[PDB]
Amino acid sequence: SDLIPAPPLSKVPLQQNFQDNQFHGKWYVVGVAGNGFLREDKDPIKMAATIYELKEDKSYNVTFMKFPMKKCQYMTDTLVPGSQPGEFTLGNIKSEPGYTSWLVRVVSTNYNQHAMVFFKAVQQNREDFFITLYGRTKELTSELKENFIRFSKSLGLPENHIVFPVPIDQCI
Ligand SMILES: [Ca+2]
């Protein structure tokens, strides 16, 4: 009853010279892909803003809709500095009563338009991973979306594990 094994970090690019002070602010989740959820027809992933606040200790406070982003419930957690700039540990992506935490690698960004971010369970026995496509706006180019499908598939994901939330539903 297990998941598609997570890729090694060797297959995941890291944004070089990551600028933490340009990555802060509001990002929309334009695309989500992962091994741990299915493209539900009658309960779709909602588009939600994610807020990054940069702290003086170079952590971020991050505010986001709880995964898997089907209920209009938000949480705040912390991105703690990882091995390099642009890589972090995140404590939680939802209510997690088990021994669970997340490695976060900013794969690519241009700060003012798009980002792609990789997440994988830290725990040795866990295979959970996902990728988010961030937009400063609710819409991104065909080119940016196709590149997200490309990256997502490169990590073993089939098409039914890749979703683009409708840039609508402010969770009324
Ligand atoms: Ca946790």
Measured from the Cβ of residue 145, the count of other Cβ atoms closer than 10 Å reads 18
Omega within 30 of 0 (cis) for the link into 165: no
Structure resolution, Å: 1.8
- Distance from the alpha carbon of residue 65 to the mean position of ligand 1, in angstroms: 15
Residue with tokens 């990882």: 82
Structural domain including 45 reads 1-172
Evaluate whether 132 touches 117 at the Cβ level (below 8 Å): yes
- Distance from the alpha carbon of residue 139 to the mean position of ligand 1, in angstroms: 30
Residue 113, phi then psi, degrees to nearest 5: -140, -60
- Distance from the alpha carbon of residue 83 to the mean position of ligand 1, in angstroms: 19
- Distance from the alpha carbon of residue 95 to the mean position of ligand 1, in angstroms: 8
The shares of helix, strand and coil residues in the chain, as percent rounded to the nearest 5, are 15, 35, 50
Structure tokens at 83: 């091995």
Give the chain's domain count: 1
Evaluate whether 6 touches 120 at the Cβ level (below 8 Å): yes
